[PDB]
Symmetry: D2
Subunit: 237 residues, 4 copies
């Protein structure tokens, strides 16, 4: 199976697999059953922003999800990630719908990884930033239903020609190049990610959510990973 | 008095004011009596590197001090810094000698602060990097004995025309511009700093150390802050 | 007198001091009489963006001023800037009104300077970015009429409590720290600047314009520099 | 055939295909016959640094190649690159030996591309930096003889187990992800690259050189591109 570390923006509470009874953000370490969650007052139809950070000295994975003027939700978890993940990874965004649905629209996405040793000049860094997505994004690996649309946005899940979201959809976008997130001689390894998103829905209880995730480089959408599994895991273990 | 947050590279153990009985790195929150320390196997005559990081989501101030091939020391402390520090600050390096002495030579120094809201474009950022220091550094506020020398290095404490360190010395260097490290509407505030240093000494027990610190913008060397107080505090409370 | 290098967004044609007969952007080297200009179809009431770049290898100062979907104007000039400017400078924005008027509202401003030698790690860099301006910007030197307003914007020229622009106004904002833009041992020196602006006016022929400029560190608004002189020069020579 | 833009550090003068009669740096636009060259006093056995820059406003491709304390060579050429290159590219380093030989050792390599529109936040950016190369660089496409060695350096051309260079060698390293270097709606597109290199040789006239190049994403070493052709072109046209 894949090896998965993820920050989930979980719009739909699946209490039968350990979700809290409200929409939440969570930190997922090799399981959909989040190691840490926080209540998320998500705002359908508003543009939100997520910021995710980690470094190997502090060993604290943190995320904040915000809507201008409305709400800020933070979640953190203490974990040695470079003990969980392989040394080379790909990074990506995932999203799903299930019986219930929502758009999972990514408006922008940026990421920075640094592998330091003894200097101000790092041993390695990778930074990418997209504030719009081209119609043929050659630096993205699109998986499942993920497409880019005429407005330059990344639609992780299926939307109709009029933009209405569809159920039973899964899609992911990985950055094309592998990322060297740890190396035995590194003094410190860090990563930071930001994305902005727009979740719209006609459902009373929209679903299922969006994640930023880090995985083995050959990661692919698991069989049976739809809906509540957010396109990351094959089961709810 | 000034308001001080600092990471100390403390070369001399002053057990009578709460130092551990070995050279150590420490996190100092408004007191020379570190809130957290780690044993530091410091290598006289070798170039070392310090990396310091913090963000307001994780609320964990961490530092790693390293010598290539030799040693790595890490220390962390959980603290809401933007509750300790004013909204505007200056950032700097300090060093001292006392009865015992050492060079406190800074070879390079970089710093980044970010004040984010809802976007990939921050509300504010400041980044500076020096890999050498000019003879008249107009973007530094030099305090006490601090000078720049013919090799382009920053000598925080007094050195002879032949480079031999002198006792009873204190010096600091602040970046000229104030730094906006928090603002009530910020989603996240972060800072990162790196410097490389060279501590040489003919003393069996060199002293006193080097710090990276953050203070009120009008910070100045306190009266009586020499030696064990590292040019940051007026007393050992 | 001051030593001035500037990119002017000149909204008002003063043909009697060498302006073209249309609104224009220009490159100014120690004179309001631009060394190079380009016609600027400026859009009152729309947010524009300016990008300015230079490096000491290419020795070409270039600027592009754009309005989304509407227009793009470019101007360039071949010049050895590090032969014109002192080694230490301050960088800033200026604006004026005269008999005719306009708002000179800066919404965001960023700047990067790099002083390189033999490595990927530079000898020096400075980067700052403002996507909003605080009510008390301690890292800006405000000169003349320049203020920051309740929306977080920088108003270079005087505006009424209702936002109506006033005539006979001059204002500038400098970054607080001096910038080391050349050094004899540098392999390459570069700078880049971006700002976004909003010019509104009830006048048929708004005036006078906005500049990004680089000057001696002790630069101040010259006597008699109002209106057509854009707060940069004491005369039209 | 491939579409090639390159900066060549040409150590061996092949006057029969248009080289100057001395080692030189050159700007190559779809031909090994450089559009612009400069004399290069290359220093065998010393570490050199190359810096390359371009932006679509200035439309000037420039390079500087330097040895600390010894020499600086600059070359520039005015060209609309985004009229020469496809919209998506890969970027890389190449090197060759022929009858004569040299090591073509890359010690570090960094690259930044920016695709801007109306804001401080770009429409796209990609930045990578390597100050050492891992034994299995999963973010590099190694072509021909290129390998990474035990010191963490990139050896573009073949070297013996003792480090002696071999003749008749060609090797290239491309960054894994494609790069979006132009887009019709971009206000400005820019790129910058730096690498440091070490050329050693026992030959009186070492050969053949190192390039930084930009090409169609599916670029590969052309048949017959050895020696004087630097692994970039199939012929000397
Ligand atoms: O899209 C939201 C959810 O829809 C389905 O689960 C249900 C939500 N309400 C229900 C009511 C009945 C049944 Br049976 C199911 Cl399976 C559900 C499943 O597709 C879940 O994986 C998904 O999280
Ligand atoms: O430079 C190292 C130290 O030297 C002095 O303290 C002493 C170190 N060994 C001693 C022995 C005797 C006395 Br009395 C003192 Cl005050 C010291 C003081 O200057 C200390 O502040 C300083 O940390
Ligand atoms: O604000 C626009 C201009 O207004 C004044 O110049 C005039 C513009 N139209 C005029 C008509 C008459 C006279 Br007299 C003047 Cl001085 C002007 C002067 O203040 C100029 O410096 C300025 O560029
Ligand atoms: O490595 C340097 C050069 O060696 C060969 O060319 C020669 C350099 N000196 C010569 C002398 C004779 C002949 Br025949 C050749 Cl082909 C050469 C060829 O391999 C060239 O492509 C290459 O640039
Ligand atoms: Ca769920
Ligand atoms: Ca001590
Ligand atoms: Ca004018
Ligand atoms: Ca040649
Ligand atoms: Mn969940
Ligand atoms: Mn201590
Ligand atoms: Mn003009
Ligand atoms: Mn040549």
């Amino acid at each position: 199976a894949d090896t998965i570390v993820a920050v989930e923006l979980d719009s739909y509470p699946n209490t039968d697999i350990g979700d809290p009874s409200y929409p939440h953000i969570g930190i997922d370490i090799k399981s959909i059953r989040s190691k840490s969650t926080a209540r998320w007052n998500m705002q359908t139809g508003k543009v939100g922003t997520a910021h995710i950070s980690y470094n190997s000295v502090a060993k604290r994975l943190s995320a904040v999800v915000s809507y201008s003027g409305t709400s800020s939700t933070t979640v953190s978890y203490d974990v040695d990630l470079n003990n969980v993940l392989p040394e080379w990874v790909r990074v990506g965004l995932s999203a799903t719908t299930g019986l219930y649905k929502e758009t999972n629209t990514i408006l922008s996405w940026s990421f920075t990884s640094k592998l330091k040793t003894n200097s101000i000049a790092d041993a390695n860094s990778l930074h990418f930033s997209f504030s719009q997505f081209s119609q043929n994004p050659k630096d993205l690996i699109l998986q499942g239903d993920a497409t880019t649309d005429s407005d330059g946005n990344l639609q992780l899940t299926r939307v109709s020609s009029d933009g209405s979201p569809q159920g039973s959809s899964v899609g992911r976008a990985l950055f094309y190049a592998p990322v060297h997130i740890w190396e035995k001689s590194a003094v410190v390894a860090s990563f930071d990610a930001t994305f902005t998103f727009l979740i719209k829905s006609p459902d009373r209880d929209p679903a299922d959510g969006i994640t930023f995730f880090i995985a083995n480089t050959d990661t692919s959408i698991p069989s049976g990973s739809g809906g509540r599994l957010l396109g990351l895991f094959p089961d709810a273990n």
